[model samples]
Target chain A: SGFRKMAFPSGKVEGCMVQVTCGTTTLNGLWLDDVVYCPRHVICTSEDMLNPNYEDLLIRKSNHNFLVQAGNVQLRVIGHSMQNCVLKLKVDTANPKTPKYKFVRIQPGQTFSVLACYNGSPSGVYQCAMRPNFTIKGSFLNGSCGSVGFNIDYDCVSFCYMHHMELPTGVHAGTDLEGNFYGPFVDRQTAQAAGTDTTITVNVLAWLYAAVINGDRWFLNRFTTTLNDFNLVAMKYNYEPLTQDHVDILGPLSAQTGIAVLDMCASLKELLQNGMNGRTILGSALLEDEFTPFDVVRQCS
Target chain B: SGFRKMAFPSGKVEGCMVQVTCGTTTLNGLWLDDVVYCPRHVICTSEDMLNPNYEDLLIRKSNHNFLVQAGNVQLRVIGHSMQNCVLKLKVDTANPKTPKYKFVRIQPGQTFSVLACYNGSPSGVYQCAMRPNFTIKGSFLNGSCGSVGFNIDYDCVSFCYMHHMELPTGVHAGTDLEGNFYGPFVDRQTAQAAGTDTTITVNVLAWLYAAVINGDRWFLNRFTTTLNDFNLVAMKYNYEPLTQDHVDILGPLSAQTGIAVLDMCASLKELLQNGMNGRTILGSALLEDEFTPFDVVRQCS
Candidate 1:
């Protein structure tokens, strides 16, 4: 009923946190509103996305609605478990490049939220539908029922949106996209990624949190081949290629936070291996067997 | 004491935070023990520093000994108040280049911790001294003191450290190095910075948090000229220069989170201007005046 006015004389994102009503929007419940607020993690102006992964704090919900108040900011509502929800995301406006979602399952009681504040433009619009129920009640424009609605159009040169609406598509290993093994790792059969700077690295990690933790196989397929090409942000003050060793380099794979530039690459390798019944995910097309997928320059080129 | 062995199959830093005793060290009190722990925010292997600024929740102390458990993991023990502590930092081992902490206040009960896990080499060893009190109890190597001690050597290729002891040097404008308006600006007189990626950007902000939040003029002077040259971590997904407007561009300085490649340069201008009674931190022998220090490319390439 009332809008709170908070002036950030200090001008810190931290200020955006303590003082919620930075602008306007009576929408309550679990949310991150940037519109009427001074803006906490607006994603747009954020110099770099810190390790902002929310799968841990967001497990169950009674009367909660996840909201992304700013434009261009991407959110993915993963299922409560690997078998809980099903979904489909429309990441583009024109062709609406639908991720093969070779892993899209069909389920219900769907309720989720996924946000990764990264880069993009206005041409990028998000349109997703959760399975077993695509009610308009679950959707809203800028004007909503005091809740984070569906579809966000950003104010930028180019628009790119991530369709993280219900990506809980995980199956048994060696399972084909139709029923068996498949994950975020390059299926050689599916998967990929993006980025050049640490900025790209952070945002990717955020999305990966939702995928790997929640087991979103649908999101997995789209990022297929990318797993083989993604590069790290170079953590050292100088030049030093990341190898397979290093306690912090991220050994094996799980829903843990591996933040090295090398971590992601190694993860895909491990994830691919584990999901494939203990055998390493290899490509017979080349002789780089037993090598790392992060196994960069391992003949993939 | 028994040691805790935690396998990071997930290989995530989040795991490191939850499972505190992943490694060793019985050190008590407020601490971030990475030696024995799985390494949460380990500066060494971390791909990038997430908005890792700790100037807020760290203001008070009960049984608190701000301990940074990892080597080269620069920590700045700020003071209780702007006039709370005074200190000096021995950043390097060779000559121990003392930060002309020209702003080093000679106070007592010095306490602070500044950590900016960004890019660096192993040669970097951090050795700082809090004035009015530099005791043996305050120093220790990898041995006992289970608590974090001073002077940490890293298992890195190069060694470098942040000398964040106790820097709280603030004065009014037009004041001389010995007195008047001399903040972290280029006084054309002192200061400078580095970085080819956003890695440099984030770390710089972390250090600045210690300086600006607690008003550490000593730290400010050392980062002097660097302020003038420091670039922001380009936030856009593409090429687009930052300007003086942009609501999110960070206006009129204060102790807030302005994480843009443009934020630092603009901040220095503001911090310098305010400390100087509203005069911009400008340098003559150039007409690019009124332009942004982020005001990049106006002259000094």
Candidate 2:
């Protein structure tokens, strides 16, 4: 029989209590007191409320494995899983303050590549992971993880080609100077590509970083020194330096952020290689069809 | 017989005038009265004084004969004389105030080519002559004179090529965008050239003259319009227009004399073709490679 309670003079009965049961078990801390005591045996948090199956949310073991391959300023995320999975990438792990990431949803036995360029650093650490699409979170994984470190070596030839051939802005981003399209694409036939902007930006920034490093100077100093040195060579070749106004205009731009400096430097380098160097800027014509890599290195050095 | 007197009432010789002779003849006007008189058998001028043997200064006949061949914005001074002789060129005979001339010391039996390009007119008269080295005056004829009348058919291709390629200033005259040397030469093999500065100047001036005429406007209108039109095209291509400062700098240059305008126009045209057109000017990148003749004509039109 269940116990009954009667009201006392304080409008509360100390002897008045009911047994709380979950099926056949009696719940503890369920006594009728001044305020009807019902103390909790376990605490519930916001996290627990939001994800009630938190304990069951274990790291899902995938049926397949994943691998990350590093290339020039890039990484490939390969999925060997039997099911479709989502992949994520993080660049420059050395400094956790600002981590850059890219993500891709991959099908079974597929590969996704991304440009993992980091600004202001030549060599950087990269981390990548893959999981079932539903389990994927913000650059985080609940499944398999992989990583590779990359050190970009300047491929000046390819870099120059891309710099000259690719239009870095506007709707014509992947087009050449003649508005013809080309690629640093993932799948050229399928027209699926990643890291176009990122690749270009990274390669260019890496080149600038290398330039600064190789030239043994800061970015601005290397920039101005390159221009002036190129001008001296041009003068020996019977050409004049760029107009003071032009030099003045370009001088301040090198002091901008890394991306800005890289962009300007890449453009000038392309122009120079195409024979529109400082001499042309100073009222000379483009008179050479080919310029050696030495031309570029000499100026930066 | 001649009567001679010492003095008269005015302290002047009366009959003391003596006969003057240069071989077997007596010179007239040698008599003296109140003033002493000296006879001048020939009339002299600045031209005659500058060139002493005026009477004997027959146009030096070349040992090798010369023939004038006309071209579009150009002329050839063909030497038929059996010996090497200097050749000279003159353009736009109507305007003596600014007489433009080019000289070439042509070898015997060879032709000296010159660009006698004229502006503002389809047909122009050119004069050429051969002389010994020192006799080659400023586009003058001290030898056998030959004249040719040339009618220029608009060679927009070559015009644009030259407009885009040539520097139009100083000694680097006949060079193209690749620094390959081109024509308007005294001789092709030795790279001996004439009218490089002069021919480029005239051809460019003539082209600008034609641009103004073809555009159905004057120099200033065509200039400003071309720049504005180019700006619009650049904007469509997502490039910024040239700086107003550059435009302003160039605008006033158009108002200069013909040769000055030609020099400026040629330089600007080369710059535009090289992708340094608006980019170097306004801090935009030189993002394009192929520029068509239409790019220029459309603006002028």
Candidate 3:
């Protein structure tokens, strides 16, 4: 059997809260209000909710019987205990205002992997723990598994994750929450929020590739419109506009090799440094209504 | 023998000049100062030049009988008579300051084809004739066979010819004759001189394709700088900058599929509509000291 560690008990167990004794000390307690109080390591049920011991002997789990490992863009979990349990993971993204979370059912001998920070993998500072009857009742796992701190290098992966996940939803492809089309403006805002230059770049490349593959020219048009707007703004500010460099860089993006998503961040940063103005050249021969999937096929093929 | 038409004799023959008489009519005369009179149309020799009759009977051949056909960027010349003759083709390019010409030998029974405005070909407003002693004294050929006017559609082929010929020389790759780096600035000047928007666009695409093939980052940098400068100038003058549209257009230039050269002309016209500012961006990432063939390969590969 694998040895497990438990968090030291501190808070008092009172009211109808049932306490658990490990040797001579009370390890933890569980509130019986809406939570299932199971004395044995077994699956809790509705019938058990009617038992008198459920109110008196509802001992909370002392340790979350699970293991977690965080990697570049993934989170893995393994159930350690002989009982089936639900694990809850919470993550605060680069935007601290909106935290995300994930929940998974861990069978006694099962392992699960999570990707893209959805359901609280490793995006920002994250915490994972076991749930009691779908309620918060157990201590979180200790060590790196409990809380993974943020790093700048993770920004690219995080952005890529979000891009990959969100793009398929087809919601954020054309515009941001404010209805502003996705381009330098939205990219800058996202990067600034992430506190990393590469975040938006990675996101843009992912979206560009997706849009191309899916034949979403309208989305591409929106992106180009934003690019046009940025050029106008940069020109107005007397800074070098990104349009030409963007053109030059995009010269290599295609369907086969795909856009070099990682390399574009530095290029985007260079473009952003020049700032943007508010005027755009029209009559783009390539961006006209005739631009279609056939064009993309012609280019990439 | 095929019936052939010859020019009628009109000028008087005199003064140390050789005369050719067809029965009672004197056909024409040629000065013997620097020419040989070959009755049989054999390749002329020093002994033929020393003949006493060479000075007295140096009659210029009557209408050097030949026919020319121009198609598919080539000019083919056929000698109508069983007489070898020297053909001279003079072409005044868009730049009238530097006219181009080609000289080729039309064998007695051979057809000669000229390409690249060389060896007597069609490239611009051109005139073809039989030279006098391999000189420019003879009258030009008559009808459409003798002259072809200029057209914009010919510009691409003409520029391609120049690019193929000049790129190998390694002279025009870095800068123009004025020592200005080769880019949109020089292209514009040339196009304005040519009085057609497509001329410069055609030239730029040719050079860009060549530079990419040769991995000439400096050349590409020069072009991008001019593009950046144009954006700045357009912004200054309340005209639209070329940033976004430029990006939109370059999405197809590649190593395998070549460039979307023809479509870029309209895009270039849009960029040039506002003209360029004297300003240009410096310190291009690809043009920096750290740039290498590996980098170009990495970028383009």
Candidate 4:
């Protein structure tokens, strides 16, 4: 059987943990022989949690695999919708304090692939701690399979000889995980000591199409409130009193578009009203009775 | 022959002076006969200033006349487009102003019916301005003559002599200020200034079965712009920095619906860059250029 070549550019990450998992076995020599191809399908998800919500998920099935689990292993994408998919993985072996994670943008319609190999320097849980950088572009389409390349770590004790086995094939499944997964290298106590070191591969299948435009709608609506507050603060900074023009402009637009201008205004008004109340300049509050509290303000702020 | 009464709701204005020309006219002296059936024909103008830009003006000649304009004189509509024919007069009014002029809305397949009479005022630019609280919802039709209604003042004037008019054989020849009669009130000046203090009447005729939605588009567009500006000013007063949310909320609904978020963002960026030069702290000048002039800063402050 012929072996497919893997493709890898520069890989790097920063301020994030990294993870790597292998699907191939030792006797197969890190390559799946006579593997059947499956038709490709595109998935898109919205990134903006506030408006149009979407997510992206990429899944590939291995026909011959008995190493870890049964069925198929699926890859789910999580994070902001606008993130790039193709990434250059960089490892700083000398310094344990600083690990850099850099994201590389993949060109539209261009395919970037990764190869799975048996290795064990940073085995299991250690790999889970390293959040490697990856580049992303457009949605994946059917009939398009990317080629991935990676070097095998022959020196590691975990990278020992083993028998090749057939991977059971059936239907692909998805799951949502809540608790942490234990590994041979790291225990619960040691992992807890690392301080947020236990990495969770949050598999999120976001619809790519939704993420492009509709996803922005959520952010837009939320941002509107912030903008409203900004305007109110601006008025106070200028020390100018609100006039009919302000009423005329803000009242209708805020009502119709659900923009946050009024909310923002309320925040500024709150500060001023509190100041005034302290000085006894104004007895009443600036906003209406159903005023937002500081907790909401803190969350938004 | 029955007499048709003529009424004036109020008075019109000349410059700063208000005149109850028609209201003050003694309508009791003028004799009105039975409804004089006038043939409904399209009205057009030969005058250089008042000719319509579009082709083929449509008109429905009313089956009534006022004796105040020496014998039988036809009053027609003038102003704006054919959809919103404005200003009513016996001949053609020379000058135009809001105090002396008003718009009369028309419906499809309707005839203008006389509704009231004014016996106290004689004619000499009997400009009568109608109050805002007035509302006249009347309809009239005669098989071949079609149907129409007179709003506000016209409703009063038409009501005055709806039942009184002398019917001549066929229809009275449509005449202009020069006494040269033709189809309806087709003279350019008369059709141009019908509702003003000037002795002018303009007649506009819409084609049967033609769409009136075009007129709605114009009015709605104006309304959207006004609302958008209003929102912008309100936000500015609140001292909030403008953002995409502010624009999305304040922008026309039609525009937002038709374009994508990214596209809208780009367009807004261009506009923000050009128009808000000194107004915005981080506009194009500050963001793109390395240096900002101290004079500009001082002036802005």
Best by lDDT: 3
Instruction: Sort all candidates by lDDT, best to worst.
Output: 3, 2, 1, 4
Q: What is the TM-score of each candidate against the true structure?
A: 0.17, 0.18, 0.15, 0.15
Which is superior by TM-score, 1 or 3?
A: 1
At residue B130, candidate 3 shows an lDDT of 15
Model 2: lDDT of residue A264 = 46
Candidate 3 wrong stretches, greater than 4 Å: A1-262, A271-301, B1-76, B79-164, B168-301
Candidate 3 colliding pairs, count: 17
Task: Put the candidates in TM-score order, highest first.
Answer: 2, 1, 3, 4
lDDT of 2 by residue, B7-47 (tens): 00110111112222222222211111111121111122334
Candidate 4 residues A165-201, lDDT tens each? 1111110110001111111111111221112111111
Q: What overall lDDT goes with each candidate model?
A: 0.22, 0.22, 0.23, 0.21
CA displacement after TM-score superposition, residue B170 of candidate 1 (Å): 29
> Local error of candidate 2 at A169, Å?
4.2
Error of 4 at B194 (Å): 28
Index of the highest-DockQ prediction: 1
lDDT of 2 by residue, A53-119 (tens): 3223212322122111222122222211111111122222222111122222222111111111111
What TM-score quantifies how close candidate 4 is to the native fold? 0.15
What RMSD does model 2 have?
A: 37.7
Quote model 1's TM-score.
Answer: 0.17
The per-prediction tally of clashing pairs is 68, 15, 17, 131
Model 3 per-residue lDDT tens digits across residues B1-301: 0000111111111111222222222211122222212122121233443332322232443333212222122222212122222122221212111222222222111111111121122111111111111111111121111111111111111111011011111111111111222222221112211111111122234334434453333222212235565545445533334444434444445333343433333333333453223211121111111122222232232
The better-scoring model by lDDT among 1 and 4 is 1
- Candidate 3 docking class: incorrect
